[PDB]
């Protein structure tokens, strides 16, 4: 029917009537703020604090919670559903760590979808303009395909290293950053098989299936180390935070951002490739914003809680070390690859000042951070030692 | 030079072959099944096409909020008693929400699959979404609302009552402890199957008919994630229909998950229904029928049968217990209102009438009840009564279910009236039903919660109010309230003078 | 004077912070879940607050441990001195060598409460917990309902106080 | 108050009851699609189409109008307020073109907010990046400040062209795509300074004052031409359609193609910038978009018209000569700007196979629809001579 | 290396230096002013961040129109005379919506300053948004209304009634026909701040009175964007103000701005207020004398007297004639109701009260003679009765202004009762006031519009409506009705056996 056969509160005017008729003069209470409780990390409290602090309900014996008593159903054998037991780093208050970003759900997949709708317009404009006329032929049958496809293994693997944080987080707020930096690095993968999707539908021999960078990464040698490592953060570490630290402040930032930014952001330009560094552009966005996440975790937090400062930086400290040797030996495997490119692509003049931006970068950024002491001509020089 | 692109399928097309082999690739979660690397998923999606489709949901959602509902004083022209149901729905939905996420997150660990990893991440960040919707509500209610009491804190205030232990357990606990598949069981081929997707939506219902149409506006988003999360519960099956490990253990796994999440739902939903609104859409005991015995136990579970699913053999219990337990609980919930973090309301003329008209006796024993409190002064703060007090006048003990949490009062109940008590190393447990007591016998280094009665023993109340903030802003009025009316409410003090202090029920046996 | 703030937790506090010395604070610890966790604690006494307790023992152990092992040492040696990875694969030995479940649950049980971190490495105990927590399981949920209440009272050994069913 | 002092016709239970009551049984026409007598280019009826045509008010006289009568108040001297004497072209609909697109209000900011939004996105991950260091200095400093930045002139001449059509266009349809064909160049011309302004932050020295570019543009002699074409383009056309037409049909395709795509996609990349090509994907992607709605209007609707397509291709054709030779002047003097590029950067022959990608992708695009007997190598060996 | 960006003003900053000196560098259009070189504009917006803003408003209102609105069916919850009264309010308002861009174009090239012409621009943009915005609403109520009929055609059945004929002078071509200070004047100056701004709020409160929540989400949204075209308005003085010419044109463009302007709104806007609506929110009368007396003709103008502006000189003779101007307007539009897409309604006895009440004598003039209409059967289909034959019968001509094109009945009207008839050149011209006769006289070439009687002289009304597609989709029954009803709707047969032929009534001088 035109006014259906469901009558609503709001609208119908019997039940509208009775509705009024029981409501009080005022509100029962003035305190409109949901989350009001919680302690602002800026001025005012945000609608990303809101939303998000305080929805795990841990109990007291678990820093910051605000609840009380065990688990009402534990694992077979005792294994509280979390637990402090889940991750070496100690802290006054696991509630205490902000996504600089303030992403809850709807920012974070709104950003992601404009990203995704200017990706496919971009793609239409690219091949309407014919602009792979102007491409190297060899760069993007060889060093594209096979080599940056390839590394779309390294971001899976990373995505995948986050599974356990996702179940073992022991907050809100950094189960949220955990699971976006997870994630954003799928997309990053799943862009790299984009693009060369794309090339598979304007170059009329070039082949998507992944088998050819899929064979150079579980066999080659240039990213041998690489998937060494990879396997190891992710399937080897059974903490939490020792994952979402190595991965984020030490692997991918010195590994990850070598090949991204200093090798094929870099590189792909000269070849007269401007398709490539379209999704790099993504992939840093999401770095750098991620960035930001992990250092307010285990810096601002952990590295630097009133408590446990020592202690947590200590651990990292070792986490550190005992990540950045196999970092080391992806860097040197990856090195090799550049014997591969063209006569007079780049010198190792070049090389070695792109490894000092990504030494020097990770040293400010990340090392300083809970004062490792790390040698920047020792670290350069040991990976510099894989060239031809 | 024709305009090309690539879209999600494109690209799904080849996310199987993007795990590869290696000596430790296995799920770090302890499990009896294998779930097969083979298994796909249903929906074709990568990261940025998610981003998208969930994206144009929240535009609808947060626009209609923002504007219209605004607009229209949505948030105020709601009934007082909805207006409180809402905040334990919504918070409450919320933490199942929230560790839904945890779980996921432990079942994308748990298959080896891509796609199935995939399938579990799509809704690890379904999770996420829905998380931050449940706290929207209580967020625009309490921004918005009649009385934000309760919506603005729930967080920590739920932590005071009894009925927050027990929806832990049904969507905390036992979406993230123990076996994955068993997890599995208790979120998607339960859970969600059985009782989220049919409550959400009518929840949207029953919300409606109360002047509530910010709900539905969030509640229907929330409904339309759930297809994908059906099936990744039924994939989860498919995965390890194959290991014989199954024919051994996934029907066991199974009843204990179907007698977990209705052991919960079938007394807690239809009391927030019945009792937490003034216009009905539906009787429980029909309501709870169709889903549980029809739609879930007759057509879902059917389909699984070629995977060797059978119905739980604890079905029959669990409708012969249905009837009265959402009117049970009601009673003890009103007798221990000073607990809760919302305000509460005797059924009105009406609604007893509605009550006898559909439950045959009801006036008789829940009725008279409640017309006798009432007249005693329950809803006057200078009674000096809290029902509470009735129920030990009358030796009416009120346990609290090791395993569940869910409370109940075998001298009183309509219902089951079965009570099971134990003593095991110098501690006292007390059950409410077959199944549950199996439980804790083969399981009880699994179930060592302290119940509301053992850590507030020998605590007076208005304290454990006092101490755990169950007050409203001017720090001396209770958040709960015996009744939904704009005057007469109880403070801190009214408590206080009532002298009630806690005691060990189990403690009588000694 | 109740929940979050106590005398009893009060007095534990300022019982930690006498401790100075990794192999003591690491013994009170391993100590107090032999007495007030898992359902076979010495007692029941301090039910309300161990949860609370405990963690702040482990503060306590983590801090002295991190000071006193070596960075190699923090990462495969137990805060006892034992190797991690010899406890763990011992372990899970006796584990695949129960007979039956009420053997295994003892095992598992045990384990939690000897090395839970900051006494083992979580690396290594959460692999443990992988492993042994499987097992566990695989011999519980066999013919789960087989056994009938009466019996199974009797073999889990709980005193029954009261029965009553209509 | 509680309720507030206005009742709401919706909601109030006395107004309410008094609506419904008045309310028929059901609805008094079952046909309920606005827009239903306008004929649908493709299978059903568009939410773009169905809002926009016949918007217009045009009577009968002003081919395909639904109103009839003149216009209530002309100007003085009696110039009607829309009509056939503003444009040389004829047609038997002016309500027949389609945005390829569908772009209504709505759907074109949405995208333009999505690209706005990503691009800030962009320039914050691009800076905290650090990857300004690997730009060639003097690519920064000369081309990009000086040339692309001249080149804004370019683009704000071409969106100026479009204020008159803005004002005559004969259609609803017409008008709607020729205004976001204009605000799509003003656009274009603001990232170009957004790009200046963005170097000025990062890079110490550089100065985002236009005084530079504009006496570049003003003054010098790489674009001298183009700054006169624009000039004609803008101010010496006051036919709507022969600006539109010559505009996007022949010299932005012409010579703002080469310029964009040619010259500083197509070296930008040799010199280690990323940044420009960023900007130029957005108005390459616009161009396209543009170029859609273009060919519909001017082929499709107009050349192919079934009553005037002869006559149209003629003024087209005679358009597309009168614009051409101030096109290949343009192109002409532009080749000048080769000579100041460090040694080695081009070469002449890759100069003259870019110049015919473009000379050829227009000959496709747009000449061969209207029968122009274009030459391609005549036109080339007219540009080359500028190559000093 | 610390995160970077550029906004909207750092890069306006520059946007001034855009737009280079050239001897050609000059306006297209014809015209008596200067717009200053350096002109400067109030919101410094660019092209990216301009769409980003609207992209945010127009998220929130489709939200609320597909979601929440359509959830609650507020497209059918609407009171049946508003439901008509949108149809012509949504669409005549749509027309102006689409001509100020055309209007904005010709400002656009009209300014010299970067900054002022990309003032206009954004105009341009709005007013693209506001055309759409207004098809939407009529859109929305032909999906979902009660009556989707005129709603679903109304750019083509609007051709047949004569109100659309003066809608388009002070909407159309008003606002881009002549010099181009004339039509900023007309519509930006006069239309937009006195008229428009006002009016846009007040129809949603009209709306949100008679049931309608969709026109307000609308309109409250293209609200929002006014205030920049109000400072285009007011630039556009500043812009002239330094220039000789302007001390001697300025105000007489003014003053024909706004008696063109009023002419039209002041019958108009009073009669679809009062008489296409159920629930009243102000008296017309009181409505006009704020917003065109007191905030516009007081507070605005006066605030350019700075500039040289002064309060129009014919604002005495446009109150003075406005009192019953609606009144007398609508008699006619009810007794050529066959003319319009729309369906009308007699002054119920609820509503007479009212206009008595308002407007003293109303009843013994207009009352009666709607009394009067309903007992000849206006309302009746089988009556063979339409109250133009009332006027025929009762000699009292019709007559279309040559200028305004505003129908009046200078015999009849409690109003103003001129009427000035004169021959030119072998064509007849009738005016109704003394400045639209100076407009003719001074700009003869300028009012050639044929009015509805030249145009349909001689023809039988059946056949026009016919002609011009005034039937609904059974291709019988009329569009326009003289009654809201569900039931006994007038068909083209009904009028055809009136055997109504129209006749120009000029004709009868000699
Ligand atoms: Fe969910
Ligand atoms: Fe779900
Ligand atoms: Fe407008
Ligand atoms: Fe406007
Ligand atoms: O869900
Ligand atoms: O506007």
Request: hydrophobic share 40%; net charge negative.
């Amino acid at each position: 029917s035109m006014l259906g056969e469901r009558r609503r509160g709001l609208t119908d005017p019997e039940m509208a009537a009775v509705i009024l008729k029981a409501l009080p003069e005022a509100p029962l209470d003035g305190n409109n703020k949901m989350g009001y409780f919680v302690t602002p990390r800026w001025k005012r409290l945000t609608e990303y604090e809101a939303l998000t602090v305080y929805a795990q309900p841990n109990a007291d014996w678990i820093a910051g919670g605000l609840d009380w008593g065990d688990w009402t159903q534990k694992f077979h054998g005792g294994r509280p559903s979390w637990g402090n037991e889940t991750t070496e780093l100690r802290t006054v208050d696991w509630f205490k760590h902000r996504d600089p970003l303030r992403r809850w759900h709807a920012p974070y997949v709104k950003d992601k979808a404009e990203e995704w709708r200017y990706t496919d317009r971009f793609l239409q404009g690219y091949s309407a303009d014919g602009q792979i006329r102007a491409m190297n032929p060899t760069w993007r049958d060889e060093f594209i395909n096979r080599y940056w496809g390839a590394f779309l293994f390294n971001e899976y693997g990373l995505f995948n290293a986050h599974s356990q944080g996702a179940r073992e987080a022991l907050s809100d707020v950094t189960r949220v950053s955990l699971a976006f930096w997870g994630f954003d690095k799928i997309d990053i993968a799943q862009m790299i098989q984009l693009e060369r999707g794309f090339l598979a539908k304007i170059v009329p021999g070039f082949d998507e299936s992944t088998a050819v960078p899929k064979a150079e990464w579980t066999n080659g040698e240039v990213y041998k180390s690489a998937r060494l490592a990879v396997e190891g953060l992710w399937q080897e570490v059974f903490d939490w935070n020792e994952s979402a630290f190595s991965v984020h402040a030490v692997y991918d930032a010195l590994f990850g951002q070598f090949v991204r930014r200093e090798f094929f952001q870099r590189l792909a330009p000269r070849f007269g490739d401007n398709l490539t560094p379209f999704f790099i552009n993504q992939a840093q966005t999401y770095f750098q914003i991620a960035k930001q996440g992990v250092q307010d975790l285990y810096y601002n937090c952990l590295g630097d809680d009133p408590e446990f400062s020592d202690y947590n930086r200590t651990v990292m400290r070792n986490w550190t070390g005992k990540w950045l040797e196999p970092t080391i030996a992806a860097l040197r495997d990856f090195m090799g690859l550049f014997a591969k490119l063209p006569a007079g692509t780049t010198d190792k003049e070049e090389i070695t000042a792109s490894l000092y931006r990504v030494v020097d970068d990770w040293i400010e950024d990340y090392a300083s951070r809970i004062d490792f002491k790390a040698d920047r001509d020792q670290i350069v020089k040991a990976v510099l030692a894989g060239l031809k | 030079r024709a305009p090309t692109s690539v879209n999600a399928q494109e690209v799904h097309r080849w996310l199987q072959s993007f795990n590869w082999d290696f000596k430790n690739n296995r799920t770090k979660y302890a499990t009896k099944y294998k779930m097969a690397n083979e298994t796909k998923e249903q929906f074709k999606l990568i990261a940025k096409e998610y981003a998208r489709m969930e994206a144009v949901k929240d535009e609808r959602q947060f626009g209609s909020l923002q504007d219209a509902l605004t607009r229209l004083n949505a948030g105020v022209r709601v009934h007082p008693k909805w207006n409180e149901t809402m905040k334990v729905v919504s918070n409450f939905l919320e933490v199942g929400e929230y560790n839904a996420i945890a779980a996921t997150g432990m079942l994308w660990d748990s298959a080896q699959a891509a796609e199935q990893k995939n399938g579990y991440l799509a809704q690890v960040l379904d999770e996420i979404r829905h998380t931050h919707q449940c706290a929207y509500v209580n967020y625009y209610f309490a921004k918005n609302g009649q009385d934000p009491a309760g919506h603005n804190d729930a967080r920590r205030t739920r932590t005071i009552g009894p009925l927050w232990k027990g929806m832990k357990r049904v969507f905390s606990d036992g979406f993230i402890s123990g076996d994955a598949v068993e997890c599995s069981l208790n979120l998607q081929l339960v859970g969600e199957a059985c009782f989220t997707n049919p409550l959400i939506v009518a929840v949207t219902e029953w919300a409606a008919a109360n002047g509530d149409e910010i709900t539905p506006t969030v509640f229907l988003s929330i409904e339309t994630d759930e297809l994908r999360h059906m099936a990744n519960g039924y994939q989860t099956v498919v995965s390890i229909a194959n290991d014989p490990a199954s024919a051994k253990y996934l029907n066991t796994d199974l009843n204990n998950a179907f007698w977990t999440q209705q052991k919960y739902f079938t007394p807690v939903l239809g009391m927030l229904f019945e009792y937490g609104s003034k216009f009905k859409v539906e009787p429980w005991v029909k309501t709870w029928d169709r889903w549980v015995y029809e739609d879930w136990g007759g057509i879902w579970i059917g389909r699984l049968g070629k995977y060797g699913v059978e119905s739980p053999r604890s079905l029959k219990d669990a409708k012969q217990d249905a009837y009265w337990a959402h009117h049970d609980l009601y009673l003890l919930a009103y007798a221990l209102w000073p607990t809760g973090f919302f305000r509460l309301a005797l059924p009105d003329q009406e609604e007893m009438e509605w009550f006898e008209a559909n439950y045959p006796g009801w006036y008789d024993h829940y009725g008279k009840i409640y017309e006798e409190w009432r007249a005693r002064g329950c809803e006057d703060p200078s009674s000096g009564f809290i029902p509470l007090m009735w129920f030990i006048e009358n030796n009416h003990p009120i346990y609290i279910d090791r395993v569940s949490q869910v409370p109940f009062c075998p001298s009183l109940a309509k219902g089951a009236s079965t009570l099971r008590v134990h003593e095991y190393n110098g501690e006292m447990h007390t059950f409410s039903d077959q199944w549950g007591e199996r439980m804790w016998l083969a399981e009880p280094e699994r179930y060592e919660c302290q119940n509301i009665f053992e850590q507030y023993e020998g605590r007076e109340l208005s304290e454990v109010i006092a101490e755990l903030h169950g007050l409203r802003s001017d720090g001396k009025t209770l958040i709960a309230q015996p009744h939904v009316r704009g005057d007469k409410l109880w403070t801190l003090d009214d408590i206080k003078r009532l002298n009630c202090v806690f005691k060990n029920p189990v403690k009588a046996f000694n | 004077l109740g929940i979050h703030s106590n005398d009893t937790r009060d007095a534990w506090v300022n019982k930690i912070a006498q401790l100075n010395t990794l192999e003591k604070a690491a013994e009170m610890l391993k100590q107090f879940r032999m007495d007030h966790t898992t359902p076979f604690r010495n007692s029941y006494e301090l039910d309300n607050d161990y949860l609370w307790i405990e963690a702040k023992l482990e503060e306590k152990v983590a801090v002295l441990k991190a000071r006193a092992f070596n960075e190699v040492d923090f990462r495969h040696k137990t805060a006892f001195g034992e190797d991690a990875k010899s406890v763990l694969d011992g372990t899970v030995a006796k584990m695949n060598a129960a007979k039956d479940k009420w053997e295994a649950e003892k095992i598992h049980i045990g384990f939690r409460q000897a090395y839970k971190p900051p006494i083992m490495p979580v690396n290594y105990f959460l692999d443990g917990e992988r492993q042994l927590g499987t097992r566990l399981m695989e011999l519980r949920n066999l013919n789960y309902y087989d056994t009938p209440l009466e019996e199974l009272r009797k073999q889990r050994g709980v005193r029954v106080v009261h029965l009553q069913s209509p």
